[PDB]
Design a protein around this ligand. Structure first.
Ligand SMILES: c1coc(CNc2ncnc3nc[nH]c23)c1
Length: 167
């Protein structure tokens, strides 16, 4: 049993809810929240801008030190940093950005990072400001992630379309 409430069960391991990921993290304080990161960990907008704002910019300060030491992530890659006031850990995952011309085949590699964690609160990778089709992102998630993933989809309209169209 875990603390996640109000989710629709899609599969053995994948759950979904119309919820802003920021407010969900603050309520649950999950072990792992996933950020929709870019390779520079520049948390300007979308999910990343919203979680960084909720940490009062502490996520960005930690991220800048990480990049100064290690250099940029890979598209499809990840790193584990603090969850600050939102979670124990934040898993920063880089899905391909269609609005930068990145290979959508990298979306499966991105979701494979989730398998290193038993339970996660996450957004749909490459959705929102990253330009991919969220229906596709949900299909790759279900077909790639084997650990228990709780998805927070804020756009009520999109949530209803994801559920209605789910095979
Ligand atoms: C209300 C509208 O957006 C938010 C911040 N959370 C958020 N932003 C963007 N994409 C999201 N996906 C889940 N939660 C998200 C709150």
């Amino acid at each position: 049993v875990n603390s996640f409430s109000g989710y629709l069960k899609l599969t053995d391991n994948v759950y979904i809810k119309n919820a802003d990921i920021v407010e969900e993290a603050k309520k649950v304080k999950p072990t792992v929240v996933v950020n929709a990161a870019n390779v520079y960990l520049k948390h300007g907008g979308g999910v990343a801008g919203a979680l960084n704002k909720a940490t009062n910019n502490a996520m960005q300060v930690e991220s800048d030190d990480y990049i100064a030491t290690n250099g940029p992530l890979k598209v499809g890659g990840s790193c584990v940093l603090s969850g600050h006031n939102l979670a124990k850990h934040c898993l920063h995952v880089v899905g391909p950005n269609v609005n930068k011309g990145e290979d959508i085949q990298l979306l499966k590699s991105a979701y494979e990072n989730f398998n290193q964690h038993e339970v996660l609160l996450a957004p749909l990778l490459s959705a929102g400001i990253f330009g991919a089709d969220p229906i596709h992102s949900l299909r790759v998630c279900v077909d790639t992630v084997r650990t228990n993933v709780y998805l927070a989809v804020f756009d009520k309209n999109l949530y209803d379309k994801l559920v209605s169209s789910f095979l």
